[model samples]
Target chain A: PGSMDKATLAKYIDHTLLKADATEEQIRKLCSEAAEYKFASVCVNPTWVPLCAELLKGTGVKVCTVIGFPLGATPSEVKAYETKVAVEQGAEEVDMVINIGMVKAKKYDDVEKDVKAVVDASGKALTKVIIECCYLTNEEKVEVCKRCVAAGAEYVKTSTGFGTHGATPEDVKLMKDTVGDKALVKAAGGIRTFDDAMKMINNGASRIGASAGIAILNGIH
Target chain B: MDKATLAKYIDHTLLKADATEEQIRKLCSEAAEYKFASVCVNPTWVPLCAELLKGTGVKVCTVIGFPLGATPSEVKAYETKVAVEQGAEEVDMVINIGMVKAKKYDDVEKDVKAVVDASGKALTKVIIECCYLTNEEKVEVCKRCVAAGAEYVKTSTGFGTHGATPEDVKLMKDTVGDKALVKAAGGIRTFDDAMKMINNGASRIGASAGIAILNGIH
Candidate 1:
């Protein structure tokens, strides 16, 4: 299962660095490395979107960002405004975390509205809805997966970006089993090293989101 | 009754937007004796609080960009660094209410991160100052705090048009979810009010009436 080579995992890596203290010097280095590694994208915070957008421009490595990140508690309108501005500022892909509070409270209607607002405002950018799966039950996960598809999001992701449990095989498989071919799954949080990447890919994750992208590919060599 | 439970949840604040060294001593004395969570004071009192509460197991908490969180991010981060270096163990920083209102969320999140990053080992708490915010803005700012890696999302700065409410506490608690804890500061006074905030998910309380609340704990 760990047979995947650097080239195989490189295409799956969304080189991510959302550290609170990351400087321009650091982000620029991240950009250079992403281009060198030929990774899929470089996900960062909203403040650095434009810099990342311009830096990774022709490198075939895209600029990805988070909206309602880590905790998706903002109003749909607020998230929509964030989406429109992010796309306008050159975010090629937006990973918007769902309002897990609303989902737990069973406000499926509001949750779907929140996702739809972001998707509607995403324009040509790919929309990845992060469900922060570590906090949800299987039923809640299935419900949100349905909501993601109904809202027309291009991808459904896992984890709260950093703090929680990251991604697990059971979650990736369940997300894949539920979403099926309707929407892709992006595994994030804790997918580090080559084996972690391969395990998720085998379980049904279409993209890998990690700060350890370089390390994961290095393991393959 | 659960006097000890309530005392520990209380921050035993003397923000001393107005202070006296004598009053700070009393504040620290009260805090230590009650076994409160921490003594939330202005930056100037951090060293005193730490010195007095030394080995008392009580923490020293101070505010950053306090009263009005309109200061530049650099200043807040520096103040946090200075406070922690002086012995502060927790810092409650206010978000740039204007930035959130202007819809410059990126700047707002970075403003929060500046303090969280500069706080070193100090526990970082963010105050959204609810009186000036809509529920939507509150929710958005709480998420930004989580993204910025703040340990707690707090309700108000006490210098705002009003202080914390059970409604605001519930909303913030619900918004931060399990990612972060919630602190309710500002107007809470009575034991009943403190209990209400705790009931609504406030893990910490900040008030000048800790004695009164404890006294009312019958």
Candidate 2:
């Protein structure tokens, strides 16, 4: 299952660096690396979107950033505005965390609205909804997947990397089953090695969000 | 300091990434019972806190730009406006640390001013995230905060590498002078820490240990 070479695997990766203290110089390096490796995208914090966009210009590498971030406790309006502003800053893709509290509270309507607000605000940009799957039950996971599709998300992602656990093959398969073809599945967090990435891909994740993209590529043998 | 006096200066805060609704409700209840100045939470909980603390004289407080003050100015302004509309009575906003480090004082002031303007009648407290700044950077940010029309200058976001210190509070107090108040947050877990902050010119304290601090007092 882990037979894909580094070049082919890189195409499925969103090269990410979302540490709280990531600097401009680091982001420039990240963008340069994305350009060098020809990875799918360079995912960063929203604050660095413009710089990333400029750095990755003419490279065919998309500039992606997070909204609602590791903590999805910000108001829906706040997340939507973040999306709108990020898009203006030249973010081609936005991965926003869902309101984990609302999902746990069983407020599906509000959760759907929260996702939809960002989707609408994103305009032509792609929106990937992070459900922080580690915190959800199987039922909760299915509900969020349905809401993400209904809300028009381009992808349903697992974990924020700050949660209790990261992407699991079981969760990936469940997400794939729930969303089916309505939305793609993205496996994020703890995708440390080539095998982990392959496991997710084999389980139906169409995209991989990982800070260990280089390491995983190195592991491809 | 008396428990009541201490409570008045405390902003009962809970900004854990996994904070649940029940936990926020408990925080609000604790704030009401202890008469804390406000129940400070993330922006999403503002409406709930407002509803929970209604008629109890406890204010609803939320953060802007949050632990990291790297978002664009427009986004922070929008966040402030939405928080106010959601019934936030006070907003604690973080300054752009990179701008401060870059010596972009003008941009820093503009960043703070945007939130102050968007806050409408709500009080604006600028969080400097003191742990990341040098003493000089800290003082400079305090000056910019005052120039931007903020009502208070705050010391940390509690999510930083370090939290409030008497030395930082004293410096912030001296820098802002009487033009703005000082708020000490982060690592202020004990009653003595709260007392030290108040004695060092802090008019407000942000803490998750409000009940514990109150218990330590009497």
Candidate 3:
């Protein structure tokens, strides 16, 4: 069978660059690929956002940065401040982690407030609110997605891809179907193959972020 | 809920200072038929439990700082490293309650950091032993767990003066500062208490009364 070209895959990608130990050379590689592929955005950790932002400035690839990161248990104020700083560093999109503490505690109000604070702090920057769905229950997923929509986020993401599990199709379906169209779905974490990416898109993921782009594009159905 | 049903929620814990191999094998077999959450024994029993429950899904959990959190950071790290090598999938470590109470927050933080860093890929739980802490201390320790990279913050060790109080769980919820999970342990003798802790902020429950607690629920 013929390969699926970049154009078919580009729009679905966030062109992720979140390796904790990533080198300048590696980040440069990530930025170059994202630019070449004409990806929707290049998602990098906050530290590398500037580098990516600079590299993709003239190339039209947007820069996206994550706040609070692998752990969503940081205070809302702290996350909001992080989002503000990332945006100041020229991040076009902010993927903020939710307060897992609040979610487990069933503090839906606090979680909603945390997402809203990040949204307000992002100014006009696109915001993807990560719920870290791997640790949350089904009911919690639905409740938090509703809260994310109410908080005015642009995307309701599944995980940081650092948890016990990642973007399983079942979870992606639950999140996208639950969040509905009010917030677009960004399925991340362990999106390793073309089949996995398609599973996410078919279920309603408007954006896909991964560390295995080549593998995913090459994987057999 | 009969003994069989009640046993499923119990961890069949054996973190006693005087735990022996004979008792551990008995605990593993009891857990296997009844199908408990896991057999939470000391690190020494990991190989035993792994061997005993070879074909079963019963997880093996080990503890660090059994009755006291006075072990030095390096020792805690070494202990966790050894425990993981011994086949412990889950590690429940004790936070330096004395250090936290003594206002040695940095020491307490480093204490957890050493073990969590050494945990490699094991799920590490930081036991704050809530019965001994004030509300402020609970929050402070929870924040430290997040900063130190622990997967969970546990309250109580069931050996303290008091255990798993609704008030304590609520206080932990108010203070865990968005980092790490809340686990309610120590003297959770009833299902009501477990449910209350779950309501407050606890994602996991650590109890010696696992059998009795579930019986009370049904």
Every model's TM-score? 0.57, 0.94, 0.51
- lDDT by residue for model 1 (B1-218), tens: 48888888989987532245677899999888988888988765677788999998889998876655644576567678777888989999878765776687999999999999999999999988888888899999999999999999999877666898999999998888999999998888899899999999999999999989999985
Q: In the order shown, what is each candidate's alpha-carbon RMSD?
A: 16.3, 2.0, 17.1
The digit string of per-residue lDDT tens for model 3 on B1-218 reads 36554455456676653344566777887678667778887654577788898778788888875544533465456667877887888888876554665687887788888988888988888888776777887878888888888888877776666767777777776766466667778777787777777778777777766666766765
Residue-level lDDT tens digits of model 1 in A7-84: 777999999886543556778899999999999999987667878889988899999988755545434654676677
* Deviation of model 2 at A45, angstroms: 1.8
Candidate 3 similarity to native, TM-score? 0.51
TM-score of chain B of each: 0.98, 0.98, 0.88
Better of 1 and 2 by lDDT: 2
Error of 1 at A199 (Å): 0.7
Stretches > 4 Å off in candidate 1:
A1-3, B1-218
Task: Determine the TM-score of chain B of model 1.
Answer: 0.98
lDDT of each: 0.84, 0.90, 0.75
Q: Give TM-scores of chain A for all candidates.
A: 0.96, 0.96, 0.94
Predictions ranked by TM-score, top down?
2, 1, 3
Residue-wise C-alpha lDDT for candidate 3, range A120-184, written one tens digit per residue: 99997999988887777899999999999999998998888766677877888998888777889
- Superior by lDDT: candidate 1 or candidate 3: 1
Q: For residues A1-221, could you state the per-residue lDDT of candidate 2 as single tens digits?
A: 74688778889999988765566677888888889888999988888898998888899899888898777889888899999999998999999988878987899999999999999999989999999988888999999999999999999999888777899999999999999999999999999999999999999999898988888899886
Ten contiguous residues with the weakest lDDT in model 2 chain B: B95-104
